[PDB]
Amino acid sequence: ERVGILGAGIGGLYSALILQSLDVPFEIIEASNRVGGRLFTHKFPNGGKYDYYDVGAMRYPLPKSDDKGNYQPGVMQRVGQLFTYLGMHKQLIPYYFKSNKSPGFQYFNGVRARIGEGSSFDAPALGINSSLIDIGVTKIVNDAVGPFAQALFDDLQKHTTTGWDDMMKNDAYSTRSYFSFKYLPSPSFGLPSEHFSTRVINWLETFDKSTGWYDRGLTETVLEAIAFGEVEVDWRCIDGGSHVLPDTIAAFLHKKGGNAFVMNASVTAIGLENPNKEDSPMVVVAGGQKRKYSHVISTLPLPVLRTVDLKNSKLDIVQSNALRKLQYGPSIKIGILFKEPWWTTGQDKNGEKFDLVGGQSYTDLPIRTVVYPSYGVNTNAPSNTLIASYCWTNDAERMGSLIGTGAATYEEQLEHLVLSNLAAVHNTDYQYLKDRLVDVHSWDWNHNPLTMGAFAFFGPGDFQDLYTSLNRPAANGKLHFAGEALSVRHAWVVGALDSAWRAVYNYLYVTDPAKLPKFFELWGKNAEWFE
Amino acid sequence: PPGGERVGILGAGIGGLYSALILQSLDVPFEIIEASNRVGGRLFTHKFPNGGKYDYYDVGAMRYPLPKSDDKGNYQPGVMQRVGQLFTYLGMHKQLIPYYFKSNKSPGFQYFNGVRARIGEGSSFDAPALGINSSLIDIGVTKIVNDAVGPFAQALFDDLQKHTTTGWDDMMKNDAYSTRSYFSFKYLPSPSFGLPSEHFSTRVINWLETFDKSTGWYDRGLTETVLEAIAFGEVEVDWRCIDGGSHVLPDTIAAFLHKKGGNAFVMNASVTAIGLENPNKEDSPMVVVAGGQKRKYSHVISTLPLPVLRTVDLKNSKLDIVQSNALRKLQYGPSIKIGILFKEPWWTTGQDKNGEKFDLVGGQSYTDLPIRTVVYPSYGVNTNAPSNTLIASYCWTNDAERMGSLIGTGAATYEEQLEHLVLSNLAAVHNTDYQYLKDRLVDVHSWDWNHNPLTMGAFAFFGPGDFQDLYTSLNRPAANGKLHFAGEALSVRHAWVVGALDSAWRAVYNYLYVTDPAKLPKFFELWGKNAEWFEQ
C-alpha cells in the first residue's frame, strides 16, 4: 500500500499531511522544482524583507480564533486549523481588506472619489435612474444573491443539503440571465416590478465584480459571496508570503519516514498497470519513469489532466466530459517595487495626502484593482511593493496579451499603461510614479502550463451536470480526483483542502475503513459541514 | 470641403486597407499608421522555410463562404458579396481556388467519447451512456440546433433581402440570452420532433455544444450563434481560399495603393494617444501620437481592436460614457492554431494502423480531444507538389484558452510537451500510432491570438446583452464627429473579413456625410448603397 500524490501544491501537501498522520505511505510527484503551486511568492531582488508580493493566494477570511489557535466553525475553519496544526497561528498577521487609515479610491467613468463618499460616478448619464443609484449596487446584489447564500449557509450550520438542491434547481442561470429573466426587486425598494435592463445589469457588474463575471454561473456568484464572508471574518495573511505555508508542510514531511518528494518530474500518463486484473496497481509515468502505487490522488488542474494520457484509467463518459467542460477562469497580477510606499506617505498633484495603509482601490481602467500591502506596515521597513494590477475574467484575458512577451517594447508598453492608470486613479502625474519605480514583475495564470488557467470558475450548469462525476473515483476505484476544482470554494485554499479531505476519505473507505474514526477525529467528520 | 482634408487610418489590416482603397477611389487624401513592420493584420500567412510552394498555412483568415459568381467576377447578392467584389476589383477573381469545407474524397473523421467514425456515418458516439435518449439521437444535434436558430436566422436573412430591420429588432429582444440560457429557459422543440414540450436539460445542451461548436461557445450571446450560422451559410455558398495564402489580399491592396508611387504607409509606429488638438474648438484637428511623433488629421478612422483602444490615451477624444463602457465590456474571444510541416501529405496517401486508407483531400476532422479541429489543406492538392503542411489544431473559446498556456512559453520543454500532445491527439483521431506521425514531422508553428499585443484576442465574440446595449454607441463617432470606430468588432460579422469591410464602409460613409456629401453617389456606385442590405 502506497499512495501516489500528483502535485505538491497545497492540495497535495494536505493530502500528504493526512496520510502521514494515519501512517499511510505515500510519495508526492511534482513537475517543477518548487512546492506550493498557486501559493507563489515573488520577492524582488535588492528589496527589503517585505518587498515581496503574492502572485497567487494572498488573503484568508478566517473564522475568529482564540489565543491558542482554536477556530470558530466557519467556511475557512479548515484553513485556520491547518495553520494551528503547523505551529503557524502566531505567524498570521492582519490583512486589511479596506485601508486601515483613509479609504481607498474608486475611479469610474472619469470620476474619482473615496470609497464610502457616495459618488454616483456619472451613472445618470449612463441611464441609471436615481432610485437605483440611491439603493446602490451592493444592496441590489445582496437582495438577489442573499436568499441563495443564506440557504447554503444554513446547510453548513444545520448539516442539510436542501439549500444546495435549490441552488442546483437554478444552476442553469448565469448571474446575468438570473437578473434578465427571473430576479424581481424587493417591493421595499420601490422600483418597478420588472427585470433589470442589460444597461442596469452591466452597471451592477462594473461595481460588483469584473468584466464578464456575470456570464459565468450564478452559483459561483453565490458561493463566492459566502467565501468572502458576506453571509464575522478575521482577514489574515502570512508573514513572509504565502510560500511559508507549503514550505512549512514540506519541511515537516521531509523530517519523517513513510514518504518522499519526487521533484522535477512531470506526469505524462496515469493508468492501471493491467485494467483487467482486480488487484492491478496504478502506474504513473513522470519524468519518463514508471512508478507504481496502490492508489493515486491527483491534484492536477483539470486542463492539465487533459494533457495527460489517461488510457487505462477507465474514466466513465461523464468524467471525461467533465475534465473538458468544467470551466476555468483567468487572472493576472502585476507587482511593482517602488522607492517608497508613496500611497502611505505621499500626496497627489494638488497636495492631498493619499494616507493609504493596506486596503484596495478600484477602477474601470484596465488595471481594475490595486492592492496596497498589509504586511510590514508597522515595522521599521514597511513594504515598498504594490500590487499595481489584479484582474479577473475579460480584464485579465486582455491584459495577459501584454504579459510575458519577452520583448522589451511590450514590457515598456505594459509599464507605461500601468503607471498611467495608477496616476489617473490616485490623481498624480505619470512622472511622479515613474520617478519612484524600481522594478516590475508580472504574471498571467492563463499563460502557464502548470495551471492552464488561474482556477476553476464554472459556467452555468457545470455544478448541476458534471461536478459530481469527478467526486467518484476512476481506475477501478484507485484514481481519486482532487485539487481546488473539486470543491465549492473555487479559487480558495480551503477548496483544495476540502478536495483532499474527500480524496483521502474515499481512499480510506475502500482500503482501510478501520482508520475512519481516527481520520474523522483529526481531520473532521465532514469536508464542509460545520463543527 | 476644407482644402486640407486628410484622413488618418489607424491599422494596416484589411479594414484599414479597404478604407484606404475607398478613399483613394474618391480622391480623399489619407495616411495609414501601422504599429508593426507588416500589413494584413489577422490575415497572416506563415510559410515554412524548409517546405515547398504550398508549405504555408493561414494563421488567421483562411476560408471565404462567398456567393455564387459568374465568369467575370460578378457576385450574386449574399452575406459575403462585399468580399467577392473586392477580389474582383483587385483582379484576383481568377486567383481564387476551391476551399474544401468537407473532404473532396473520403470523409473526415470524428472522434468523441473514445468512439471513431467518419463524418456522415451516423455514429452516436456513446451518447446513450451520457444519458441522451434515443429520440434526441435520432433527430441529431444539427437538426435540433437548426430548429432553435433557424427562425432568428431567417428573419435576419429577410432583413438583408427586403431591406428591413425588424429581424434585427426581434433578435435584440432576445439578446440578453446566451445560447445556453435560450435552451434552458425559452426554447421548446418543434412539435414535429415528438419530444416532450419541456426545455432541454443541461446534459442535453452540453451534448449540443460538444458537436455543434466549441467548449463554452453556448455561454456567449445567442445573437452570435445566429449570426455565425448566417455567415457559415446555413441559411448556397462557394467556399474559396486564396492561392498562396490570405496574405495575397492585403499585399495586393498595398501594391495598388502604391502604384502611382505614393501613399507611403507609416510603419513601425504604435499609436499611444488619439484626441482633438483643442476639444473646445469646433474646427479642431485630430492628433495621433504614434512612434513618439504627433501627426495631425482632419478625421481619424480607427481599425484598432477594442482592447487595443483601451491601452491608448483617448483623453481629448471625448468619448461619451456609453462608448467608453463599450470599449471595455464588448467581449472578445480567443483562438489558437498549430501548423505542422510533415514529410508527406499522409492524410491523403497514407493508411491507418489496420491498413485503411485515410483518403482525405481538404476537409476537416473533429474531436473532443484538446486539438478539437484538424484542417487538411485545400491549396495545391492537384499540383505536382501538394502541401505537406497540416493545421493540426484549430481551437476556440475554452479549448483555445487552455491550449494557449502551452504556446509561446519560450521554453523547449513546453514546445516538446505541446508537440507530443498534438501528435498523440492526431494519432487517436486517425487511428495511427504516435511514432507514425512523429517519424513524419519536420517543423511546428503555433500561434495564440489571445497572447498577442496587436490583437489582444482573436476577434469580437460578444456576450449576451452586448449587441443590444453597447454596440450602437461605437457606430456613432467621437471627438466632435472626427473619430470613427471601425474594424471587424464594429459589424454583425465578427471573425470574418466581411465584418472589417462593413465597418470600413460605415466609417467612410459617416466621414463623407459630414465632410463631402457630393461624393456619396460615386461612393454608393463603387462600394454599395448599404453596408449589409443586399444588392445585385
Ligand SMILES: Cc1cc2c(cc1C)N(C[C@H](O)[C@H](O)[C@H](O)COP(=O)(O)OP(=O)(O)OC[C@H]1O[C@@H](n3cnc4c(N)ncnc43)[C@H](O)[C@@H]1O)c1[nH]c(=O)[nH]c(=O)c1N2
Ligand atoms: C491569482 C490567484 C489568487 C488567489 C488564488 C489563486 C490564484 C491563481 N487562490 C486560490 C489558491 O491559490 C488555490 O485554490 C490553491 O492554491 C490550489 O491548490 P491545488 O493543490 O488545488 O493546486 P496547485 O495548482 O496549487 O498545485 C498543483 C501542483 O501540480 C503541479 N503540476 C502541474 N502539472 C503537473 C504535471 N503534469 N505533473 C506533475 N505535477 C504537475 C504544479 O506544479 C503544482 O505544484 C487564493 N486562495 C486563498 O485562499 N486566498 C487568496 O487570496 C487566493 N487568491
Ligand SMILES: Cc1cc2c(cc1C)N(C[C@H](O)[C@H](O)[C@H](O)COP(=O)(O)OP(=O)(O)OC[C@H]1O[C@@H](n3cnc4c(N)ncnc43)[C@H](O)[C@@H]1O)c1[nH]c(=O)[nH]c(=O)c1N2
Ligand atoms: C484565428 C482566426 C481565424 C479567422 C479569422 C481571424 C482569426 C484571428 N477571420 C477574421 C479576420 O481575420 C478578421 O475579422 C479581420 O482580418 C480583421 O481585420 P481588421 O482590419 O478589423 O483588424 P486587424 O487586427 O487585422 O488589423 C488591425 C491592425 O492594427 C495594427 N495595430 C494594433 N495595435 C496598433 C497600435 N497601437 N497602433 C497602430 N497600429 C496598431 C495591427 O498590427 C493590425 O495591422 C477570418 N475571416 C474570414 O473572412 N475568414 C476566415 O476563415 C477567418 N478565420
Ligand SMILES: CC(=O)NCCCC[C@H](N)C(=O)O
Ligand atoms: C471562481 C472565482 O473567480 N473566484 C474568485 C474569488 C476570489 C479569488 C481570490 N480568492 C481572492 O481573494 O482574490
Ligand SMILES: CC(=O)NCCCC[C@H](N)C(=O)O
Ligand atoms: C465570433 C466567433 O467566434 N466566430 C466564429 C466564426 C468562424 C471563425 C472563422 N471565420 C472561421 O471560418 O473559422
